[PDB]
Amino acid sequence: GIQKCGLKVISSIVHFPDALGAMDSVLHTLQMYPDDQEIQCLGLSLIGYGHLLAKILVSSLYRFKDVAEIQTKGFQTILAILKLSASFSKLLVHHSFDLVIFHQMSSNIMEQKDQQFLNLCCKCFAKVAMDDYLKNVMLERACDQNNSIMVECLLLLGADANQAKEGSSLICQVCEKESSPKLVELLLNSGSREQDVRKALTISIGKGDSQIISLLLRRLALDVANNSICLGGFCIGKVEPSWLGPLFPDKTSNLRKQTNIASTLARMVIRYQMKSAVEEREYITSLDLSANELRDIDALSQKCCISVHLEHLEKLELHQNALTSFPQQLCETLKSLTHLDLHSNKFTSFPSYLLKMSCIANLDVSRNDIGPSVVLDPTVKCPTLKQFNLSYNQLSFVPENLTDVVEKLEQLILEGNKISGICSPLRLKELKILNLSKNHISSLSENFLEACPKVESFSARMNFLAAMPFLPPSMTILKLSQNKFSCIPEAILNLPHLRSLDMSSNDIQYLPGPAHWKSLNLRELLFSHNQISILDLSEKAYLWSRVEKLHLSHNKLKEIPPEIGCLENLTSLDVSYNLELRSFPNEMGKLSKIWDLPLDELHLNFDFKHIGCKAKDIIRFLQQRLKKAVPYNRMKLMIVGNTGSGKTTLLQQLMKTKKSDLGMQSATVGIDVKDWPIQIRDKRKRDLVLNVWDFAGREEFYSTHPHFMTQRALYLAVYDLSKGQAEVDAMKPWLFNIKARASSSPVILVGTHLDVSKACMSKITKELLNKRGFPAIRDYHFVNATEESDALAKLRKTIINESLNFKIRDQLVVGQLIPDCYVELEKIILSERKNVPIEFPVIDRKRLLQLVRENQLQLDENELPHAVHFLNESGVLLHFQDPALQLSDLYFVEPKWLCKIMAQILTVKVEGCPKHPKGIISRRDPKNYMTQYFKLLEKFQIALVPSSLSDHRPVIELPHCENSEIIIRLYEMPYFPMGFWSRLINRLLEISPYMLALRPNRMYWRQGIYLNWSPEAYCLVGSEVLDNHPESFLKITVPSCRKGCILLGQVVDHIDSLMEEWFPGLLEIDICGEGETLLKKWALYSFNDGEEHQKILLDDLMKKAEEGDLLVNPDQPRLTIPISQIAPDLILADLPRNIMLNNDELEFEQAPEFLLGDGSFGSVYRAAYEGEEVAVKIFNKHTSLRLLRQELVVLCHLHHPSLISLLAAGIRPRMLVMELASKGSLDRLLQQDKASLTRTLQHRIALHVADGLRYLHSAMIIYRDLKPHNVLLFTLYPNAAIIAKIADYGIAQYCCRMTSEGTPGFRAPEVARGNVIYNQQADVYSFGLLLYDILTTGGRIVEGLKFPNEFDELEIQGKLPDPVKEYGCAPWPMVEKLIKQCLKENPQERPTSAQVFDILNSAELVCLTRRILLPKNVIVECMVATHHNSRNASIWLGCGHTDRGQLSFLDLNTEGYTSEEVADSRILCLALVHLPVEKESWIVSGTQSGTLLVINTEDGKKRHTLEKMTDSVTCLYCNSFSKQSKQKNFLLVGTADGKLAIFEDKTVKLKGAAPLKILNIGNVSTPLMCLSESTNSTERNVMWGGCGTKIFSFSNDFTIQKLIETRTSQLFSYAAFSDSNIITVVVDTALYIAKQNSPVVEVWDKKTEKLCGLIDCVHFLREVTVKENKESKHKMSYSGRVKTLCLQKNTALWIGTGGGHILLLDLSTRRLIRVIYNFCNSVRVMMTAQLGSLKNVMLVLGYNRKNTEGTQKQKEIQSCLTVWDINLPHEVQNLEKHIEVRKELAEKMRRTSVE
């Protein structure tokens, strides 16, 4: 008890002599005498002059929370410490500082005059909250303790509320601690992710809360702008009325303002933050409850709080729940429900009281288990039901009483049921769409449709039907597929309006000719899978001139008659899979409209499908054969041998080259292409000329031969019998490669030696070489090969007879017909071969396109790519259409040259120094040709020379080789094909991005690679020879770990993508004999992990069939091996591990169709995977596993929030799992739900699709097909995170199996013309059209279905019409410009995908409703709207371009600008006075002369110029002053000195009315310039009007009650900003004032009359106009001044600058929201209005001036009225959050790739 005196002494001397373990003892004396004797606890004062200091401060102030003014001594200390050690704050917040600073600022300090104190504590708090992290804990540690006041302060200071753990965060926490509703309301209204709010439901659903739930639903599912509740995807276990209560709107709800407390502290702290930083009705309709698993809805069927808002529902969805027994009481409560659907529920009986509903249509109960009979009560009458869906129930009879119950029914759908019996007359008077598919119907009563005279779309698929009852004469569409028919019944032939007919999969025999159909409107005739013999069209064919689809596939057709050219409109012919056609008629060339034409599984009179022949050229080709076609006699005769034979010395005698002047010739280099004609001097004048290719035999050129071994050729082969019976063996490889490359070509063995001896070699050729896997040897001779002889002459004869009988697939190749346009093209190239630089005979397409000009060739740019290819197969010129090899401009004429150059490199050796290993070589060699040289060799892959490369293999010693860590897979084949290794080791070589760009150091000899990253990941594609085996194997050993399972599954692909691309006859099932298949890809497995002494072979074909289970095991079934280990590619184990199917959780029913709901009659089903809803895609027999594995590799690494993402993929069966687009594709939406798109969902869809293209075009992959059918919506809630998602499977099937031209309607001009390769600018034109169908809500497609040939051509040139003038839709004039950019003809003039999104991300395009270009050179400076008529509105303008005034009426929907002179002096302002009587609303006009004129709304002739004033009228107004217990109003003419004349609303008619109270306020030197009225109506609409520089006010008294003056302002930086005239003033909780040429607004106050805020403009403009505006450095005399003010109700303040900008200031919390520039030049007038029940718009009358004649001291002004959606300040910040959440998802999705 002496320490008090000790500290009292120290406090004295610590001051005067500047005292310097003082702080130590004065600290421990606290801990020694704590919680007592506050006098010694005042020692804190000395601390103002080891973190123990922290722990001793927060513990002192807290324990004395409200003791005395020791807090003032505490905080002073804490403030003194902070300003010198700013780091100290990290220690305070670390302790209990939160516990003590939250109490002070909230211990009822408001309402208490301790302003001196609070300013201290806020100053102290201003520094604790400096660090970005500290706010995030100052906030989090203010939510645990329920503190609404402070949690609001820390939000206005930043401190994001979505940061805690991401998976878990504040809202999940705040909902666990049973917080206050006011606390949740602040996190949601601030930054708060959707994925965290949704998790807060299930947390807050478990517990029963009525105010914490109803605040989460309001943010998750309530589209107030569209009157909807989108509670679909949520798995809310049960719905209760107490939750949906506060969602429905209430008109009585109006609140006070109490959060201003937290708003004051928000700015006080911000003030001290800167000062320390600067110096140093409308009942909602849609209610969706889809996915919520509700086992009962009874909770709504009571008289609860919402039973008065449900009576205006008009739509209710309960599909995919588990409901049953729709409650009787409810269906009588919602007496306005007009769209009810409840399908996939577990019903078991039709309620039959649902029809008692008042006004119902589109009742949809269509997947439940409704019992046998569904009899409707015969005493209920529902004349409003239009569509009665009952599909996929369990009905066994048609519903009973449709006629007596639902009279006006339109679409009775009954598919999927089990309807069995012969039906009943079904006397429905207004059916339009029947449906009876998938039932078991045997036959219909002959009077079935005898009472429904309006049917249009009867459809009975998959039944057992044979005859048709009378069909009414009104049928249009009629589908009868999968039935059991015999002949098209005579009742269908006589339908005089039929317009489509699907009769697939029936067994009909005779398709009647067009003279039997009695209806000229045939459009489609699907007849696939029938048994149709003839296609009789000769009797009369023009009757089908409109047919647009004639599907005849899978029929027994024999020929296509020539009259099929009469079907001029035929758009999609389909005659595939006929197997007996053999010919297309040359008349088919007249089908100019065909865009697809399948050729699958039928052999024609030409060789198609090279890379082209895309069903459009085939029509051109067949058309050129109609002008003049001539036979083409030209074949290839390949000569083949091996380093010593009669190849080049037998040919010289075959051609009978008489000279052979070279006494001694040399071995061949290259292949020596030559041609000799054969003029067979016989009866047949066919002078065939076949070109010989005497291949070189030396084993070093073999790497290049497979390029020139085509399939249209007759191969020779030469023994060299001198080495009898030993050379025939050495010739098997050649015969094998002939079999590998060209299986269907003949072979003529030619024993070349007789002169020198052994001729029993005909035995082995007949024994082993004849018919064993080798090609079809058609002869064998034994010529002499050095002199003409009888033995040789009979060989020359066999070459002829074997050529003229080539006949591949019964075609006789040597004598086919081709268009003379080709033969003439052949003659000019040969005639040009003599006129080309021998050093480089190559020709560029430029030179080629001129050769046709010199002659009269009728070929176009679409013909040459086919023409010049048909000349390639014939060996006239070489040309390669590969896109990767960038030489397709080079056209190799004189093939014998290129074929010689490619072999000069393989012979150039160096007998100098072997400084390099064998096989590698650098560029050691004319004019730029050497550069062109290996710009072709590298293109030809021969560059490092993969041939002649270190045959001897190096002894590799693999790290882990213990028989259980390695995976092996042999490829036993009889001989390595010719160009196998040099091709293989050059396909795996260039793949460095394995394990994806880390290149592995590799060592590749001639027949191996062995590229290894580490002893844990390698791949050795070797080649060894087994023991006692003459085959040739390809062993591939890979480590069995995860990084190794990838390499195997990635090499086996390349080695197979090569085998079928190059040697397709290796993997060819030879059904003759047995299925040897010539290539047996074994796999190796061993049960003993190590020391197995052998690895047992196991064919892959047999093992792949063992996919029924997952384990393999021997005949001793104790132990077993997982197939993953031995062949991890058949099982999808190489792809990312997250996509293993894991069948234990996938619940999926393939067989049923009621779960196949996706689309219509498709293949992708619906299922559940990990408890969530997904969409599995069952694959048919088409897609082989090798391709499915080829597609998944590209789908697995897209990972975008705007691309359908995979979830799993597996076998049993080959299925593919993806996300379930809940609301289905987009095309189905705008086809039947056109009211759901609401001008802000039309945008988020276009933004999410332009976000997908922003990523696809980033990964260098073009979509190539973007249509309203490929966009899969996910929810119809506008302010959601994932709405649209473009289906990404389409590109996978293309990038693997390469609709490549795109759907006709949704197609670019560069892709339809087909003459130019595509670009990324094709997906933009296709997207530009997608914006045209979203804008017009699918109006082009609906009309495009009955004009399909004009559906494509109209848009294929940019000639499609205006989206507004044609189709009725709201303008949206900032996207009609984005269309007119993405719809340009030039490809590189359309905005790239990154730009088409950066101008969709703008939040100003989505609000600007319609820009209205005023007539040229009209100067208007005043406007007024008409709000008493809400049917439609008009804007009465003024005029300035004349000194004599004139009003300018202007509509809004017709935009008819009208001129009517009404005065003789320029007009300055107007006002609109309405009278509740007589139904009129006059307009008043203030002009410079003072003539106050008034004219009627209708009559433009009844006018009376009221009592003229003295100065120029400047401001008028119409008020709300009804103070006589009834309706009454005045008008306030603002003269230019203050003679405010007040009037009456009904007295305006009389000429010269009575100015009630002329209140001369100021002087002639004080002109009035504005007027206003209060924001609230509680204070009796106190008026606040400006005058000169003196602001005033009044009330019902009409006397000045305030005379605030602004020039006397004591905050002078500049003076005349306040010493100038006023312009406008708006009334709120404060006052905002505008002066002439003032770039600042002045925030005065009502009571205090002080400058509470000063907001300069350029403080915002100069912060964005820094880099994007560089020239402004000379513009220090800035332009842009406040011209007008407009204050939204409580949200933002619209400031119109003298420039082109417009300011959005959130008057509550944050100042700058956005500055909307570059849309005008001078925002001169701005005000609000309401338009046609789409109220609350913000008219903005800007200017526009172009200095066309600025040198003539004149400017051309164009006033540009606009209309902004008043919800703009929300949208601009609601969108900037919408992009943040998607950026946060676009990155986290990129992490699932690496993780």
Binding residues vs ligand ATP (CB under 6 A): 1158-1159, 1162-1164, 1175, 1204, 1218-1221, 1224-1225, 1272, 1287
Q: Which is nearer to ligand ATP, 425 or 1290 (CB)?
A: 1290
Its sign, for the CA torsion 157, 158, 159, 162, is: positive
What CA–CA distances, in Å, run from 1050 to 155, 946, 1139, 1597? 52, 21, 17, 90
Whether the bond between 1213 and the residue before it is cis, its omega within 30 degrees of 0, is yes
Cα gap 821→844, rounded to integer Å: 20
Q: Which is nearer to ligand ATP, 1220 or 1435 (CB)?
A: 1220
* Phi and psi at residue 675, to the nearest 5°: -140, 140
Query: Is 1221 annotated in some ligand binding site?
Result: yes
**Counting contacts by CB under 6 A, is residue 647 touching ligand GDP?**
yes
Alpha helix (H) residue ranges in 1002-1074: 1042-1062
- Other Cβ atoms less than 10 A from the Cβ of 1183: the count is 16
Cα gap 1411→1761, rounded to integer Å: 6
Instruction: Say which entry of ligand GDP, ligand ATP, none residue 697 contacts (CB below 5 to 8 A, set by partner kind).
Output: ligand GDP
Cα gap 708→673, rounded to integer Å: 10
Tell the smallest beta-carbon distance from residue 1348 to ligand ATP (Å).
Answer: 17
Q: Which is nearer to ligand GDP, 588 or 902 (CB)?
A: 902
Q: Which is nearer to ligand GDP, 752 or 982 (CB)?
A: 752
* Phi and psi at residue 1635, to the nearest 5°: -110, 165
Angle between helices 1185-1195 and 1289-1296 (to 10 degrees): 120
Cα gap 1651→1648, rounded to integer Å: 9
Tell the smallest beta-carbon distance from residue 666 to ligand GDP (Å).
Answer: 7
Report the residue closest to ligand ATP, judged by CB. 1159
Tell the smallest beta-carbon distance from residue 229 to ligand ATP (Å).
Answer: 23
- Other Cβ atoms less than 10 A from the Cβ of 656: the count is 9
Tell the smallest beta-carbon distance from residue 739 to ligand GDP (Å).
Answer: 21
Tell the smallest beta-carbon distance from residue 1740 to ligand ATP (Å).
Answer: 42
One residue of 667, 930, 961, 1554 binding ligand GDP per CB under 6 A: 667
**SS3 for 1252?**
helix
- Cα dihedral 1126, 1128, 1130, 1133, rounded to 10, equals 150
- The token pair at 1651 is 């400058």
Residues 698-717 within binding reach of ligand GDP (CB under 6 A): 698
**Counting contacts by CB under 6 A, is residue 55 touching ligand GDP?**
no
Tell the smallest beta-carbon distance from residue 410 to ligand ATP (Å).
Answer: 24
Contacts of 1136 (CB under 8 A, 6+ apart): 1196, 1793
Query: Is 204 annotated in some ligand binding site?
Result: no
Q: Which is nearer to ligand GDP, 548 or 694 (CB)?
A: 694
What CA–CA distances, in Å, run from 669 to 644, 948, 1748? 13, 16, 73
Closest CA to 1017 of 1134, 850, 857: 1134
- The token pair at 226 is 């569209």
**Counting contacts by CB under 6 A, is residue 649 touching ligand GDP?**
yes
Q: Which of 1265, 1323, 1333, 1352 is catalytic?
A: 1265
Residues 759-788 within binding reach of ligand GDP (CB under 6 A): 784-786
Instruction: Say which entry of ligand ATP, ligand GDP, none residue 337 contacts (CB below 5 to 8 A, set by partner kind).
Output: none
One residue of 104, 648, 653, 1512 binding ligand GDP per CB under 6 A: 648
Tell the smallest beta-carbon distance from residue 648 to ligand GDP (Å).
Answer: 4
Tell the smallest beta-carbon distance from residue 1654 to ligand ATP (Å).
Answer: 56
Q: Which is nearer to ligand GDP, 646 or 1696 (CB)?
A: 646
Cα gap 1680→1659, rounded to integer Å: 12
The one-letter amino acid code at 1206 reads L
- Other Cβ atoms less than 10 A from the Cβ of 1551: the count is 10
Cα gap 900→909, rounded to integer Å: 17
Instruction: Say which entry of ligand GDP, ligand ATP, none residue 1163 contacts (CB below 5 to 8 A, set by partner kind).
Output: ligand ATP
Total residues interacting with ligand GDP, rule: CB under 6 A: 20
> What are the b/e assignments for 1690-1703, b being 16+ CB within 10 Å?
ebbbbbbbbbbbbb
Question: Is residue 712 a contact partner of residue 632, using CB atoms and an 8 Å limit?
Answer: no
1269, HSE (Cβ side, Cα atoms, 13 Å): 10
Question: Is residue 73 a contact partner of residue 101, using CB atoms and an 8 Å limit?
Answer: no
Q: Which is nearer to ligand GDP, 674 or 698 (CB)?
A: 698
Cα gap 1218→1225, rounded to integer Å: 14
Tell the smallest beta-carbon distance from residue 1262 to ligand GDP (Å).
Answer: 47
First to last CA, the chain: 67
One residue of 513, 641, 775, 1586 binding ligand GDP per CB under 6 A: 641
One residue of 134, 355, 566, 696 binding ligand GDP per CB under 6 A: 696
Query: Is 1177 annotated in some ligand binding site?
Result: yes
Instruction: Say which entry of ligand GDP, ligand ATP, none residue 1272 contacts (CB below 5 to 8 A, set by partner kind).
Output: ligand ATP
Query: Is 645 annotated in some ligand binding site?
Result: yes
Which of 239-247, 309-317, 555-563, 645-653 is the region at the interface with ligand GDP (rule: CB under 6 A)? 645-653
Q: Which is nearer to ligand GDP, 477 or 905 (CB)?
A: 905
Query: Is 475 annotated in some ligand binding site?
Result: no
One residue of 204, 285, 668, 1758 binding ligand GDP per CB under 6 A: 668
SS3 for 1108-1167, per residue? CCCEECCCCCCCCEEHHHHCCCCCCCCCCHHHECCCCCCECCCCCCCCCCCCCCCCECCE
Tell the smallest beta-carbon distance from residue 782 to ligand GDP (Å).
Answer: 11
Query: Is 912 annotated in some ligand binding site?
Result: no
Query: Is 1371 annotated in some ligand binding site?
Result: yes
Query: Is 1674 annotated in some ligand binding site?
Result: no
Q: Tell me, residue by residue from 1010 to 1049, as one string, x for binding to ligand GDP by CB under 6 A and - for no binding.
A: ----------------------------------------
Query: Is 1382 annotated in some ligand binding site?
Result: yes
Q: Which is nearer to ligand ATP, 101 or 1220 (CB)?
A: 1220
Query: Is 1564 annotated in some ligand binding site?
Result: yes
Q: Which is nearer to ligand GDP, 641 or 979 (CB)?
A: 641
Instruction: Say which entry of ligand ATP, ligand GDP, none residue 1225 contacts (CB below 5 to 8 A, set by partner kind).
Output: ligand ATP
Question: Is residue 254 a contact partner of residue 142, using CB atoms and an 8 Å limit?
Answer: no
80, HSE (Cβ side, Cα atoms, 13 Å): 14
Question: Is residue 1246 a contact partner of residue 1237, using CB atoms and an 8 Å limit?
Answer: no
Instruction: Say which entry of ligand GDP, ligand ATP, none residue 647 contacts (CB below 5 to 8 A, set by partner kind).
Output: ligand GDP
Query: Is 1388 annotated in some ligand binding site?
Result: yes
Tell the smallest beta-carbon distance from residue 766 to ligand GDP (Å).
Answer: 23
**Counting contacts by CB under 6 A, is residue 753 touching ligand GDP?**
yes
Q: Which is nearer to ligand GDP, 500 or 648 (CB)?
A: 648
Q: Is 369 a catalytic residue?
A: no
CA-atom Rg of the chain in angstroms: 44
Instruction: Say which entry of ligand GDP, ligand ATP, none residue 648 contacts (CB below 5 to 8 A, set by partner kind).
Output: ligand GDP
Instruction: Say which entry of ligand GDP, ligand ATP, none residue 1164 contacts (CB below 5 to 8 A, set by partner kind).
Output: ligand ATP
- The token pair at 152 is 């609001």
Instruction: Say which entry of ligand GDP, ligand ATP, none residue 1221 contacts (CB below 5 to 8 A, set by partner kind).
Output: ligand ATP
What CA–CA distances, in Å, run from 321 to 294, 388, 1518? 6, 20, 56
Active site residues: 1265
Binding residues for GTP: 641-648, 1366-1389, 1563-1566
Which residue ranges make up the site for ligand GDP (CB under 6 A)?
A: 641, 643-649, 665, 667-668, 696-698, 752-753, 755, 784-786
Binding residues for ATP: 1156, 1158-1159, 1162, 1164, 1175, 1177, 1218-1219, 1221, 1225, 1228, 1269, 1272, 1287-1288
